[PDB]
């Protein structure tokens, strides 16, 4: 019960294997599968996608009952995920974050505990809490328990001073990459690019409905609610209007003590995280190969999962420029 099984590549499926291994080593998600707790959350009736949760859970069960050097096939799981998300039919190269989003949405939908107003008078935090309650009245699953947080977006009119707030749920954060750092670009620099004051002027002027006209506004994100599992997605793609290229910039991310105090909403308690998994991409935007580096929940040791090959690694080997998705858990 060490969870060091490899996954067979079925034909350009390293993106899927990398994500599956990151999820396999997401302690609470793994445990939900191993303890069969999903069975009581599945929906009654002939549903086209109950087999998605069942085959995902069976794969995780297989990985965590495997012996040293075992390689298992996720072919039955692939059949189910491509039925939920037909873009994954066949054997083409795909983006791991795209796959992650569709897979978690499919799992969430199948174990959702849910089966079927002007708030200007409220203080910001209470509006946030009410919008959160409204969200959970639609989307309430074990999958969401782990991954979902809430952003606050504050949009201030520079003319009348009105700050319009909205609260957007998130299951991951996709971070722009800073152009250079001193001496290196850090994950915190990228978080700051995400959460900074965005000036909206010129072509981007919003309409202020208090002023009844287009006005220069300042927009800023803060984190109103932190998730148990924080997935950070680095935007490794150039904005070229001719041909995107991959951004291979080293982003220095911490193994431990990722402290997000400075991104929390005003007077909102903040979270600190430790890394437990990384999805790595090597190649171009058009093709390449994925691996995963994952910390075993039980032993705390890191391994490289590269399709059928699972090998031990030092924590000193985990931070690389190939990192694309970072999986953080509360400290």
């Amino acid at each position: 019960a060490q969870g060091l099984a490899g996954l067979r590549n079925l034909g350009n499926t390293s993106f899927m294997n990398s994500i599956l291994q990151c999820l396999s080593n997401t302690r609470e998600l793994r445990d939900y599968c191993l303890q069969r707790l999903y069975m009581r959350d599945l929906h009654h009736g002939s549903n086209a996608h109950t087999a998605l949760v069942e085959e995902f859970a069976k794969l995780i069960q297989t990985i965590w009952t495997s012996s040293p050097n075992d390689v298992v096939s996720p072919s039955e799981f692939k059949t189910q995920i491509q039925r939920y998300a037909p873009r994954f039919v066949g054997y083409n190269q795909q983006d791991a974050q795209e796959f992650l989003r569709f897979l978690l949405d499919g799992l969430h939908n199948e174990v959702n505990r849910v089966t079927l107003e002007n708030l200007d008078h409220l203080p910001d935090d209470e509006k946030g809490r009410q919008m959160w309650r409204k969200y959970l009245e639609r989307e309430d699953s074990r999958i969401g328990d782990l991954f979902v947080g809430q952003l606050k977006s504050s949009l201030t009119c520079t003319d009348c001073g009105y700050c319009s707030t909205v609260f957007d749920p998130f299951w991951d954060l996709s971070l722009p990459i800073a152009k250079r750092g001193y001496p290196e670009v850090t994950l915190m620099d990228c978080m700051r690019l995400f959460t900074k004051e965005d000036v909206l002027d010129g072509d981007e002027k919003p309409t202020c409905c208090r002023c009844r006209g287009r006005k220069r506004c300042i927009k800023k994100f803060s984190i109103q609610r932190f998730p148990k599992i924080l997935v950070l997605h680095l935007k490794r793609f150039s904005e070229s209007r001719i041909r995107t290229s991959k951004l291979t910039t080293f982003v220095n991310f911490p193994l431990r003590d990722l402290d997000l105090r400075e991104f929390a909403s005003e007077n909102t308690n903040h979270a600190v995280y430790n890394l437990y998994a990384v999805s790595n991409h090597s190649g171009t935007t058009m093709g390449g190969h994925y691996t995963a580096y994952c910390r075993s929940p039980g032993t705390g040791e890191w391994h490289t999962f590269n399709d059928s090959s699972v090998t031990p690694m030092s924590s000193s080997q985990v931070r690389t420029s190939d990192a694309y998705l970072l999986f953080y858990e509360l400290a």
């Binding site: 993106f15 983006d95 072509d203 981007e204 793609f237």
Partner: protein, 76 residues
């Protein structure tokens, strides 16, 4: 109404849309400003990637929501 898109390098852009706008319409509006073709764009909101053939209203996307624009690193 207006919604926002957090683009690739730090900026946000502002789109004028209606709830009935299709995801294709939204991607075209992003292309009009950014020169990124719709077939390269992925838009994330509330953990869901928005799909061609659906509308903003299908996702209950309200005024001043932010879509997160992200490209692809294909791998196999």
């Amino acid at each position: 109404m207006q919604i926002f898109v957090k683009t690739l390098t730090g900026k946000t852009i502002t789109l004028e849309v209606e709830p009935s706008d299709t995801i294709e319409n939204v991607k075209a509006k992003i292309q009009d400003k950014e020169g990124i073709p719709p077939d390269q764009q992925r838009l994330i909101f509330a953990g869901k990637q928005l799909e061609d053939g659906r509308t903003l209203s299908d996702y209950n996307i309200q005024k001043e929501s932010t879509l997160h624009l992200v490209l692809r690193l294909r791998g196999g």
